[PDB]
Design an enzyme around this catalytic site. Structure first.
Site, PDB file in Angstrom:
ATOM      1  N   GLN A   1       9.647  -0.695   1.616  1.00  0.00           N
ATOM      2  CA  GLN A   1       8.673  -0.233   0.607  1.00  0.00           C
ATOM      3  C   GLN A   1       8.007   1.082   0.980  1.00  0.00           C
ATOM      4  OE1 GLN A   1       6.374  -2.394  -2.707  1.00  0.00           O
ATOM      5  NE2 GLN A   1       5.559  -3.079  -0.740  1.00  0.00           N
TER       6      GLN A   1
ATOM      7  N   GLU B   1      14.226  -6.502  -1.552  1.00  0.00           N
ATOM      8  CA  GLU B   1      13.668  -6.849  -2.877  1.00  0.00           C
ATOM      9  C   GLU B   1      14.070  -5.770  -3.878  1.00  0.00           C
ATOM     10  OE1 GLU B   1       9.260  -6.668  -2.734  1.00  0.00           O
ATOM     11  OE2 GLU B   1       9.571  -5.522  -0.887  1.00  0.00           O
TER      12      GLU B   1
ATOM     13  N   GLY C   1       8.725  -6.876   7.640  1.00  0.00           N
ATOM     14  CA  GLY C   1       9.895  -7.610   8.147  1.00  0.00           C
ATOM     15  C   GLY C   1      11.211  -6.885   7.960  1.00  0.00           C
ATOM     16  N   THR C   2      11.472  -6.408   6.750  1.00  0.00           N
ATOM     17  CA  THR C   2      12.769  -5.743   6.485  1.00  0.00           C
ATOM     18  C   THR C   2      12.820  -4.366   7.155  1.00  0.00           C
ATOM     19  OG1 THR C   2      14.389  -5.227   4.787  1.00  0.00           O
ATOM     20  CG2 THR C   2      12.091  -4.727   4.268  1.00  0.00           C
TER      21      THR C   2
ATOM     22  N   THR D   1      -3.276  -4.930   7.103  1.00  0.00           N
ATOM     23  CA  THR D   1      -2.828  -5.488   5.810  1.00  0.00           C
ATOM     24  C   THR D   1      -2.179  -6.871   5.968  1.00  0.00           C
ATOM     25  OG1 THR D   1      -2.532  -3.274   4.909  1.00  0.00           O
ATOM     26  CG2 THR D   1      -1.286  -5.043   3.868  1.00  0.00           C
TER      27      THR D   1
ATOM     28  N   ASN E   1      -2.201   5.125   8.854  1.00  0.00           N
ATOM     29  CA  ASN E   1      -2.847   5.335   7.541  1.00  0.00           C
ATOM     30  C   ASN E   1      -4.336   5.647   7.689  1.00  0.00           C
ATOM     31  OD1 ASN E   1      -0.408   4.856   6.329  1.00  0.00           O
ATOM     32  ND2 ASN E   1      -0.882   2.748   5.747  1.00  0.00           N
TER      33      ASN E   1
ATOM     34  N   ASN F   1       1.493   9.888   0.851  1.00  0.00           N
ATOM     35  CA  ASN F   1       2.941  10.174   0.806  1.00  0.00           C
ATOM     36  C   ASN F   1       3.196  11.660   0.553  1.00  0.00           C
ATOM     37  OD1 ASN F   1       3.116   7.453   1.171  1.00  0.00           O
ATOM     38  ND2 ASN F   1       3.874   6.992  -0.884  1.00  0.00           N
TER      39      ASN F   1
ATOM     40  N   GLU G   1      17.154  21.789  19.168  1.00  0.00           N
ATOM     41  CA  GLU G   1      16.183  22.427  20.081  1.00  0.00           C
ATOM     42  C   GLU G   1      14.900  21.594  20.162  1.00  0.00           C
ATOM     43  OE1 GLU G   1      16.661  25.981  17.628  1.00  0.00           O
ATOM     44  OE2 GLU G   1      17.268  27.052  19.424  1.00  0.00           O
TER      45      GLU G   1
HETATM   46  N1  LIG Z   1       1.651   5.468   3.760  1.00  0.00           N
HETATM   47  C1  LIG Z   1       2.163   4.377   3.169  1.00  0.00           C
HETATM   48  N2  LIG Z   1       2.066   3.178   3.782  1.00  0.00           N
HETATM   49  C2  LIG Z   1       2.599   2.106   3.143  1.00  0.00           C
HETATM   50  C3  LIG Z   1       3.215   2.188   1.934  1.00  0.00           C
HETATM   51  N3  LIG Z   1       3.640   0.941   1.530  1.00  0.00           N
HETATM   52  C4  LIG Z   1       3.302   0.116   2.502  1.00  0.00           C
HETATM   53  N4  LIG Z   1       2.654   0.770   3.524  1.00  0.00           N
HETATM   54  C5  LIG Z   1       2.116   0.174   4.748  1.00  0.00           C
HETATM   55  O1  LIG Z   1       3.145  -0.391   5.530  1.00  0.00           O
HETATM   56  C6  LIG Z   1       2.783  -1.729   5.939  1.00  0.00           C
HETATM   57  C7  LIG Z   1       3.556  -2.726   5.130  1.00  0.00           C
HETATM   58  O2  LIG Z   1       4.943  -2.540   5.386  1.00  0.00           O
HETATM   59  P1  LIG Z   1       5.964  -2.813   4.182  1.00  0.00           P
HETATM   60  O3  LIG Z   1       6.738  -1.567   3.896  1.00  0.00           O
HETATM   61  O4  LIG Z   1       5.237  -3.355   2.994  1.00  0.00           O
HETATM   62  O5  LIG Z   1       6.982  -3.910   4.758  1.00  0.00           O
HETATM   63  P2  LIG Z   1       8.426  -4.061   4.087  1.00  0.00           P
HETATM   64  O6  LIG Z   1       9.285  -2.949   4.576  1.00  0.00           O
HETATM   65  O7  LIG Z   1       8.270  -4.104   2.599  1.00  0.00           O
HETATM   66  O8  LIG Z   1       8.965  -5.467   4.645  1.00  0.00           O
HETATM   67  P3  LIG Z   1       9.006  -6.784   3.707  1.00  0.00           P
HETATM   68  O9  LIG Z   1       7.592  -7.178   3.384  1.00  0.00           O
HETATM   69  O10 LIG Z   1       9.709  -7.888   4.443  1.00  0.00           O
HETATM   70  O11 LIG Z   1       9.764  -6.422   2.458  1.00  0.00           O
HETATM   71  C8  LIG Z   1       1.286  -1.826   5.700  1.00  0.00           C
HETATM   72  O12 LIG Z   1       0.574  -1.313   6.811  1.00  0.00           O
HETATM   73  C9  LIG Z   1       1.103  -0.931   4.487  1.00  0.00           C
HETATM   74  O13 LIG Z   1      -0.200  -0.402   4.483  1.00  0.00           O
HETATM   75  C10 LIG Z   1       3.319   3.433   1.284  1.00  0.00           C
HETATM   76  O14 LIG Z   1       3.861   3.572   0.201  1.00  0.00           O
HETATM   77  N5  LIG Z   1       2.771   4.531   1.952  1.00  0.00           N
HETATM   78 MG   LIG Z   2       8.711  -5.480   0.941  1.00  0.00          MG
END
Ligand SMILES: Nc1nc2c(ncn2[C@@H]2O[C@H](COP(=O)(O)OP(=O)(O)OP(=O)(O)O)[C@@H](O)[C@H]2O)c(=O)[nH]1
Ligand SMILES: [Mg+2]
Ligand SMILES: Nc1nc2c(ncn2[C@@H]2O[C@H](COP(=O)(O)OP(=O)(O)OP(=O)(O)O)[C@@H](O)[C@H]2O)c(=O)[nH]1
Ligand SMILES: Nc1nc2c(ncn2[C@@H]2O[C@H](COP(=O)(O)OP(=O)(O)O)[C@@H](O)[C@H]2O)c(=O)[nH]1
Ligand SMILES: [Mg+2]
Lengths: 331, 430, 442, 442
Positions: free
Chosen positions: D10, D70, D143-144, D178, D205, D227, D253
């Site tokens: 995500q 997902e 997790g992923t 989170t 963050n 982002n 480099e």
């Molecule tokens: N900067 C930023 N941080 C994000 C973003 N989306 C999620 N995070 C952060 O990343 C962490 C959550 O990781 P996720 O990416 O949701 O985990 P995942 O890869 O979806 O893994 P699964 O839940 O198993 O699908 C938290 O600390 C969130 O605050 C985003 O779009 N930008």
């Molecule tokens: Mg996810």
């Protein structure tokens, strides 16, 4: 297309009492294109490929609703600026072409969509060409690199192309060298409409077309964008003419300055005027008059006219310099 | 150099309708039969498939044969059906009943003479005749029996010409008819003696082409017959258009068949890509060659990776460099050297034609001679041996009049064909 | 003075299009056969006569025949741009091809076409007063080129006798290949060609592809490029008959100087200034530089390396602004090199020719314009490598009688394979014996 | 001259949306893959090649893959505005998420999807001629991202070998959080990233929230702002491959200059002129002010204080109107400062880069338009404090096996927790030993 009208029953089908599955058009009640047990509105199965069809239509009314405005996603808010610009243009077909698309008439394989190929007309013109006919025609009938996406690079390349075209063309050659760039500048000045000495894209195109240079609208857009330094898409005639003259070598500059310094000391109070130049010039010494191809009176008359000033005007160093950069362009 | 087509049975008539649509489109023939093309290059070889009718019309050199007129009424009702000559439809009054013996011995010998009369009238009209092309299914009744009877008679009457067949064979997963093994066995026994070149197609392979490559949600027999019409119209393209390296059916046979019994071939056609993806990938010789050798793109269920290529041929259409074609064929032979029979120094023949099919920049059709054809016949022979030991439905065939000895002969001949392919698969230099 | 060109099959007709394009543009004949009348010409001229004859109305027509068994390529020539240049009788076409079978061309189908071809060649030879040879272009990889070329060369050799026959054949490339049956056709062709040919120029496609990639900057060449290079070579060899020069060379002098024994007539070719227009203005192209270029194997138009053998004779033709002293200095420098070796029985290894006409530039061409060029034909024992590899591929296929049923069914005895294979074995020994330095003499 | 981007989960896909929006707007590619008629006239350029490839019809398509378990985020890309830009095969989506379980992504579910991902990357890498590295975007908290990122990096590292892999990773911030299981996933991810990554950039963050509150005046930021800042940083690092400049810096480099020992590859990142339109018009922004800005902890995008450690190497990238002499004067002034310290074994602590293309402005963006910017990535011992805090949270939960039954149920041995915790402990000891102030001569 808007409102469907190509997914509906045709008169021939109604008269012949045609059924559904021989042609598999889902218009009859109780039959629908079900992908994964659901309609294409739901994201199951093969919705992405079915949405890529040439005849696909989504039932979205042009007049929007309130809840669509209220319910929006963060991604939509992020990427809505590009969507508004991207929704301006879209390909369209008439009804006969849509009949052909639905009936899938002319296809190499069942999924071939030639109407979505932007290079179809050049393919059609290119069809039925043989190697020998192209390669064995009638024998009588048959650049400094610039690097960067910067608009300055495009402007420099376009300026170099224009200069090459003028050199190979050479319209308006006079008895005294220096009339080509004068004609180009006069043509540009004539198509100014306001009087402040600036031009936009369309007037630039008309002016350069009148001056004898073959161009196109994208060329002028790129040139005006490249030469713009104040963010208004206005082209200054002085700037473009200075760029058309080009970079000046050292020997020519030395001769010009030496002649000007000589002429300055023969006048009173160090002020030189145009009648001084007309009287003191020695026109019968050029190679073009001694060989016997240009008369002396015609050459002097050509020289006097090219200044575009009255006979009592003060000729500064800038005017002298610019005049003889214009003349050096032909030697 | 004119070809005569014969369409037999339901499958043959249906595939033929799509083939004649494709050929009429490529030469710009209106469904009324009027020429409406836009280049002289289309006209100079129109004779190859069309006969000339008086004012504007052209008529196609094809014979339609069937035992019940249902199919003929369906083909006459199709969108291009009007083009066919009325005298070329020959039909009886009762069906084959899915029985080989009825189709071969009782109604076959009754109608065959009128078909031979039509084929001779059509053959003697050509200034120079090239081979015949036959489309039929092997699992049916009139297609297998009367098609093989007619093939035997034309091979007796014209032994010096070429005999080419496109044939449909029962899928390994779902039967459309219970008695498929008998009809298939008798037909392969007749074909291996009579044919000069035979192409085999599995409907399961066309379904896999549509679902995996084209991602069609609800394919229909029109799509399968369009893919077949594409390859059949593609193999003859060098016969009827100019090119840098011309080719011919006899030249294909001479380069493809090492020994006279090894004349069963696999087919493929390269430019296949889903409606969403086509805007994302341009055609080029590396892309066409890589898809062309992928077993996913081959029209039979057996896969080349379990066998070895004795010989193969590729016909390319379009304006392209010969160097890239030659170097691609060298690279594929060198990198996968274990899959090519080593006692032949070069297994691939290439040919180049200038004119691609409309709307495509380039295309290639592939013909392959691979030992994996043995797997289809072995599976059909297994189903035959299970049914024959118990006389499962034999009384129908014996009631028509057949001796049981024909079944044992046909089984022995198919087993010898499988053995010959297997021996060349496992052959060595020693 | 006159020479007759015989073009056979697909490669020979397509190479003929490039050759006649060049000869027209070099002499100045328009595609309609009429030279530009201009205002006037000061003195009468005759150089075209080697390749063209004029009608009483002043049209030019060329001394060539195009032979094919399939109609497509000749009908393509008949419908092209040069339709009015050729006489319609000269373009001879049959109904069906030899299908990559040497047997179909030689025994079954060519026997029907040979009498029309012989009648046309007789009608050409009757309209000459100083015919001095036949030039033949064909490929031995295909059926009609091999079979009909051999049968026609046999008939020409009986009817015309002593007249010379020079061939520009295209033999199969050592790893690029186009058809499976190439070894059988090439062996059976070479058996007939051994007895009935005076000088065999051998060409391969992989070398011209390499030359167009390395020297010119073309990533995706096609046959028109190769055929234009071959046309340049033919124009260089025939220039000695057509234009003024310091040292002319008649076609009989090639055979006298280049062929030591009657079977040793296989030769290699090489052309020097293959260069692009952008490279041409950064470098001078002196006589010594192009002379040094012709001996590098990167310049050759056949796939063989001459460092693995010994040269027996070389014939060097210079055309353009060259002075004999520079040619002599260049040849003496080449002779100094240690990686170039001659057999000890050939002490005077070189023949030279010097012509004043510089090479012509063709409007769609890819070569630059240059003031001088040199072309070489040379006899070397390294040409044995070309045969041994074809014979090995033949042995591999024949051990299992590969495809043999086609050849025996179309009318040929199985015995024909063994005689030809033994004759090529004898050719291999000719190259072994000729390449032997000396014996145990006192 | 080329780079391939891999987006996972995500955070990685959402940051990818901002990155590709920026790269399109900077080159001038429209959302439908085309390029307007005036950008392609007069000159012919290749700078897009690093991130885009063109089809023969002139459409542009980007060199990226999107991986998720997902469907929702990839379905948002499939139905959004950039639907036509991406190739549909590149957007790969599974059926169900890894549910914050590293075990579910690595062992059970990612094992089914990984072979399609490797086939897409292979098909992309075969259609290249100067691939110069992989860029990977993922978060280690989920997790992923952890499980599939580790499994895919392992497979990529065996298949492609020596080729470099640079990762941008979002680690769990020190007090904003989170999800509960973040420490376990971050430790287990870090174990895999040690062996299979060449440089790892760390992001928090909480730092980007502090930077957006302090420099810009935004009280209530959302993920699109963070982002867009990350996208600007990635554009700054990759600008050296795409545009002309005085001192270029190739991606190899960075790895050669920043990593002293093979395990010490974690770097801090900061960006200087993050400023609003009202402040931008009150201040000049010369080179020395932004050089002084990049070293203040208020400018960093990771929550660490560099005053608690010593720098080993700094790489400073300047883009826009800058002249080298001011960069040299600025670096000498920074070197003079007493609160900035370098380890005594690294005397020449700086690497510089200077590129002429100024940063692009995005229509809905919040950054001002500026003539110059500088971006820094640096290696410092202060990063050891972030791991110590992760280890404390892991130790608190693991002493009572707080959630382990999920991980053991999905296929993982309890022993793997202790192995990873001991490996990260060894990394902490490595940062203690490498940072030694001095060694004794005796
Ligand atoms: N900067 C930023 N941080 C994000 C973003 N989306 C999620 N995070 C952060 O990343 C962490 C959550 O990781 P996720 O990416 O949701 O985990 P995942 O890869 O979806 O893994 P699964 O839940 O198993 O699908 C938290 O600390 C969130 O605050 C985003 O779009 N930008
Ligand atoms: Mg996810
Ligand atoms: N250099 C060159 N090689 C050619 C050309 N045309 C064909 N070839 C080569 O010659 C061989 C084919 O011989 P063909 O001339 O086609 O054979 P053919 O004379 O037509 O004999 P048939 O096929 O029986 O009609 C292949 O190796 C081709 O690559 C050409 O124009 N130039
Ligand atoms: N590919 C293809 N197969 C067909 C078509 N029509 C029938 N078949 C197959 O052919 C077999 C039936 O043979 P059929 O033509 O009815 O035999 P006939 O009764 O002797 O004409 C079954 O396997 C059908 O699936 C068609 O249009 N295309
Ligand atoms: Mg031929």
């Amino acid at each position: 297309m808007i409102g469907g009208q190509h997914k509906k029953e045709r008169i021939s089908e109604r008269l012949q009492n045609c059924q559904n599955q021989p042609k598999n058009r889902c218009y009859l009640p109780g039959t629908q294109l079900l992908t994964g047990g659901y309609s294409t509105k739901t994201l199951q199965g093969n919705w992405s490929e079915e949405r890529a069809d040439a005849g696909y239509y989504d039932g979205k009314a042009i007049v929007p609703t309130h809840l669509s405005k209220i319910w929006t996603t963060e991604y939509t808010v992020m990427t809505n600026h590009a969507m508004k610009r991207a929704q301006e243009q879209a390909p369209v077909f008439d009804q006969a072409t849509l009949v052909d698309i639905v009936d899938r008439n002319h296809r190499a394989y069942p999924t071939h969509q030639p109407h979505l190929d932007p290079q179809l007309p050049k393919l059609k013109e290119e069809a039925f060409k043989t190697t020998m006919r192209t390669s064995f025609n009638h024998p009588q009938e048959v650049v400094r690199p610039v690097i960067g996406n910067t608009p300055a690079a495009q402007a420099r390349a376009i300026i170099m192309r224009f200069r090459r075209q003028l050199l190979i063309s050479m319209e308006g050659q006079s008895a005294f060298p220096g009339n080509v760039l004068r004609q180009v500048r006069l043509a540009l000045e004539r198509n100014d409409v306001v009087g402040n000495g600036v031009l936009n894209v369309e007037e630039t195109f008309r002016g350069f077309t009148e001056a004898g240079v073959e161009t196109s609208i994208p060329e002028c857009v790129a040139l005006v964008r490249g030469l713009d330094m104040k963010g208004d898409n206005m082209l200054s005639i002085r700037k473009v003419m200075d760029e058309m003259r080009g970079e000046e070598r050292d020997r020519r500059y030395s001769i010009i300055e030496g002649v000007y310094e000589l002429l300055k000391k023969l006048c009173s109070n160090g002020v030189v005027r145009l009648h001084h130049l007309v009287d003191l010039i020695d026109v019968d010494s050029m190679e073009s008059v001694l060989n016997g191809t240009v008369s002396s009176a015609d050459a002097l008359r050509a020289f006097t006219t090219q200044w575009d000033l009255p006979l009592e005007a003060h000729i500064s160093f800038e005017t002298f310099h610019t005049f003889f950069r214009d003349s050096s362009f032909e030697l | 150099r004119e070809i005569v087509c014969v369409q037999a049975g339901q499958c043959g008539n249906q595939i033929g309708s799509k083939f004649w649509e494709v050929i009429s489109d490529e030469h710009g023939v209106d469904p009324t039969g009027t020429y409406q093309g836009d280049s002289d290059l289309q006209l100079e070889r129109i004779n190859v498939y069309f006969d000339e009718a008086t004012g504007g019309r052209y008529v196609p050199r094809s014979v339609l044969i069937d035992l019940e007129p249902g199919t003929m009424d369906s083909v006459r009702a199709g969108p291009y059906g009007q083009i066919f000559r009325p005298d070329n439809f020959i039909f009886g009054q009762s069906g084959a009943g899915n029985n080989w013996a009825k189709g071969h011995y009782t109604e076959g010998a009754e109608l065959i003479d009128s078909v031979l009369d039509v084929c001779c009238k059509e053959a003697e009209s050509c200034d120079c005749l090239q081979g015949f092309q036959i489309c039929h299914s092997l699992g049916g009744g009139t297609g297998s029996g009367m098609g093989t009877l007619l093939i035997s008679k034309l091979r007796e009457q014209y032994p010096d010409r070429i005999m080419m067949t496109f044939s449909i064979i029962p899928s390994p997963k779902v039967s459309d008819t219970v008695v498929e093994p008998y009809n298939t066995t008798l037909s392969v026994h007749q074909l291996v003696e009579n044919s000069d070149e035979s192409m085999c197609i599995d409907n399961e392979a066309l379904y896999d082409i549509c679902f995996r490559t084209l991602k069609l949600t609800t394919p229909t027999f029109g799509d399968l017959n369009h893919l077949v019409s594409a390859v059949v119209s593609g193999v003859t393209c060098c016969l009827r258009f100019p090119g840098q390296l011309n080719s011919d059916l006899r030249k294909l046979a001479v380069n493809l068949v090492p020994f006279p019994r090894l004349h069963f071939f696999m087919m493929g056609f390269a430019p296949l890509t889903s409606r969403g993806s086509q805007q994302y990938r341009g055609l080029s010789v590396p892309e066409l060659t890589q898809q062309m050798f992928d077993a996913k793109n081959m029209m039979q269920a057996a896969d080349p990776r379990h066998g070895r290529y004795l010989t193969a041929s590729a016909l390319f259409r379009g304006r392209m460099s010969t160097k890239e074609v030659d170097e691609q064929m060298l690279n594929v032979q060198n990198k996968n050297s274990s899959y090519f029979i080593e006692w032949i120094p070069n297994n691939i023949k290439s040919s180049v034609c200038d004119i691609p099919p409309k709307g495509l920049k380039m295309a290639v059709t592939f013909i392959g001679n691979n030992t994996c054809i043995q797997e289809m016949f072995r599976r059909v022979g297994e189903q035959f041996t299970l049914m024959f030991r118990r006389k499962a439905f034999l009384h129908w065939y014996t009631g028509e009049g057949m001796d049981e000895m024909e079944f044992t002969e046909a089984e022995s001949n198919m087993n010898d064909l499988v053995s010959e392919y297997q021996q060349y698969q496992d052959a060595t230099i020693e | 003075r006159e020479a007759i060109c015989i073009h056979i099959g697909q490669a020979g007709c397509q190479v003929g299009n490039a050759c006649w394009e060049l000869f027209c543009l070099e002499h100045g004949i328009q595609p309609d056969g009429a030279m530009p009348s201009d205002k006037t010409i000061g003195v009468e001229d005759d150089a075209f006569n080697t390749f063209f004859s004029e009608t009483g109305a002043g049209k030019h027509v060329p001394r060539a025949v195009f032979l094919d068994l399939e109609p497509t390529v000749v009908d393509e020539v008949r419908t092209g741009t040069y339709r009015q240049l050729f006489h319609p009788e000269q373009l001879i076409s049959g109904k069906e091809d030899a299908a990559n079978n040497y047997a179909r061309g030689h025994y079954t189908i060519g026997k029907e076409i040979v009498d029309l071809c012989l009648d046309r060649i007789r009608k050409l030879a009757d309209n000459c007063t100083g015919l001095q040879g036949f030039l033949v272009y064909h490929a031995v990889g295909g059926g009609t080129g091999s079979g009909l070329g051999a049968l026609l060369l046999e008939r020409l050799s009986v009817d015309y006798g002593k007249k010379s026959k020079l061939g520009y054949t295209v033999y199969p490339s050592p790893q690029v290949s186009t058809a499976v049956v190439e070894p059988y056709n090439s062996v059976l062709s070479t058996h007939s060609l051994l007895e009935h040919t005076d000088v065999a120029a051998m060409l391969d496609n992989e070398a011209i592809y390499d030359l167009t990639r390395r020297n010119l900057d073309i990533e995706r060449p096609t046959y028109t490029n190769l055929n234009r290079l071959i046309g340049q070579v033919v124009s260089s060899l025939t220039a000695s008959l057509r234009f003024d020069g310091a040292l002319n060379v008649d076609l009989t002098e090639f055979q006298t100087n280049l062929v030591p024994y009657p079977r040793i007539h296989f030769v290699l070719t090489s052309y020097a200034p293959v260069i692009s227009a952008e490279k041409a203005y950064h470098e001078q192209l002196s006589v010594s530089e192009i002379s040094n270029a012709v001996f590098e194997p990167a310049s050759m138009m056949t796939k063989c390396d001459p460092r693995h053998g010994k040269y027996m004779a070389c014939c060097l033709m210079y055309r353009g602004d060259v002075v004999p002293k520079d040619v002599n200095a260049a040849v003496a420098t080449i002779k100094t090199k240690r990686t170039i070796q001659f057999v000890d029985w050939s002490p005077t290894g070189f023949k030279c020719g010097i012509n004043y006409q510089p090479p012509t530039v063709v409007p769609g061409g890819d070569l630059a314009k240059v003031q001088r060029a040199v072309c070489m034909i040379a006899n070397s024992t390294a040409i044995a490598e070309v045969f041994a590899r074809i014979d090995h591929k033949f042995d591999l296929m024949y051990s299992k009688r590969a495809f043999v049923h086609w050849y025996v069914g179309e009318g040929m005895e199985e015995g024909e394979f063994s005689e030809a294979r033994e004759d090529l074995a004898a050719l291999e020994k000719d190259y072994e014996e000729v390449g032997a330095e000396s014996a145990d003499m006192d």
